[PDB]
Amino acid sequence: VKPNYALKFTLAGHTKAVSSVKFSPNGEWLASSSADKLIKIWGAYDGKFEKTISGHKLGISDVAWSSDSNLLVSASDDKTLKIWDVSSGKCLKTLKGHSNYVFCCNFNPQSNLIVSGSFDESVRIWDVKTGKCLKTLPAHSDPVSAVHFNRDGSLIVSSSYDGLCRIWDTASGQCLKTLIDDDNPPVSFVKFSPNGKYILAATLDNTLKLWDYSKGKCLKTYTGHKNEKYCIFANFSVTGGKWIVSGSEDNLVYIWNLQTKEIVQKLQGHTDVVISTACHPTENIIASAALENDKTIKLWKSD
Ligand SMILES: C[C@H](O[C@@H](Cc1ccc(-c2cccc(Cl)c2)cc1)C(=O)Nc1nnn[nH]1)C(=O)O
Numbered sequence: 001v002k003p004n005y006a007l008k009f010t011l012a013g014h015t016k017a018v019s020s021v022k023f024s025p026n027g028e029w030l031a032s033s034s035a036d037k038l039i040k041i042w043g044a045y046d047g048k049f050e051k052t053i054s055g056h057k058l059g060i061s062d063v064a065w066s067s068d069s070n071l072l073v074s075a076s077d078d079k080t081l082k083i084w085d086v087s088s089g090k091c092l093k094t095l096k097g098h099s100n101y102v103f104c105c106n107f108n109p110q111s112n113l114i115v116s117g118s119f120d121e122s123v124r125i126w127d128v129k130t131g132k133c134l135k136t137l138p139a140h141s142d143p144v145s146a147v148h149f150n151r152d153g154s155l156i157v158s159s160s161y162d163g164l165c166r167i168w169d170t171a172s173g174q175c176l177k178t179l180i181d182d183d184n185p186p187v188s189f190v191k192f193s194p195n196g197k198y199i200l201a202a203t204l205d206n207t208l209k210l211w212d213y214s215k216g217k218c219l220k221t222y223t224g225h226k227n228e229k230y231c232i233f234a235n236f237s238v239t240g241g242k243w244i245v246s247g248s249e250d251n252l253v254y255i256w257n258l259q260t261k262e263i264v265q266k267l268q269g270h271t272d273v274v275i276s277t278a279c280h281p282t283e284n285i286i287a288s289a290a291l292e293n294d295k296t297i298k299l300w301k302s303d
Pocket of ligand 1: 193194195196197198219236238242258259
């Protein structure tokens with residue numbers, strides 16, 4: 001069993017490197033952030049441009065959706081996060097507190113909290129309603145590349161250039177686990193699996209790893225792509241077959257059979273590093289995005 005992803009739409013508009021792409025949970029929209037200090041909203045099924053959201057003073061590294069698809073959270077080099085009401089385009093809150101670039105962000109499933117990570121080596125937990133910082137965790141000894149909440153929001157997974165993945169108790173802020181393989185390459189990305197038993201981590205030694213968090217064991221390894229420098233997102237594709245999807249420094253989208261770990265498809269088309277990919281929550285759609293030499297988002301579909 002192999003998928004058949006084929007290019008359907010190319011989305012131009014960003015004037016600088018695209019940093020992240022995310023589909024709304026309701027499946028209606030695609031959000032993109034860029035080094036151009038802007039967030040763009042696109043139609044998930046046709047790639048039709050909807051709107052631009054601006055206000056950040058420097059490049060945006062990440063964007064994330066709230067569970068009801070009404071809010072966006074963005075992380076910027078202007079050392080803030082911003083909470084946006086998508087429909088009205090308004091900036092609800094500006095989260096000030098990090099001392100360096102904010103590199104990653106996410107909402108919890110209940111979307112009353114925001115987790116953020118920064119070049120200041122900390123993980124912060126914010127109140128969505130007030131925009132106040134509830135906890136500052138002295139999480140790592142190098143920049144925090146990714147942060148993500150589990151299925152019920154009781155755990156936060158963080159990764160850093162220091163070579164570690166750490167699991168934090170949302171309520172106490174105590175470190176529950178430190179995950180590392182025998183090698184120490186910088187960990188550029190991490191995320192909990194859709195149902196939360198696993199963690200998918202990306203290292204800067206051209207490797208994707210699937211860990212069983214509880215047992216502290218690496219269960220699967222996915223190789224064949226190139227990733228020695230950039231914080232490339234990776235994803236679980238679960239609408240058709242069960243796959244692992246990731247961008248690559250060789251300008252391709254790689255797709256792996258999750259169980260067998262073999263490459264099932266490679267998507268050719270971008271002219272620069274595929275920095276980010278996203279999988280549609282209900283349809284076999286992959287959104288992919290590239291750096292400065294390309295500046296486009298591509299929408300691929302499988303039948
Ligand atoms: C179905 C979809 O996602 C799945 C993705 C998945 C699928 C399979 C394996 C896995 C792990 C170890 C060995 C092997 Cl042979 C497979 C790992 C992840 C998921 O989240 N499973 C999940 N999370 N927590 N507990 N079960 C969804 O939940 O919509």
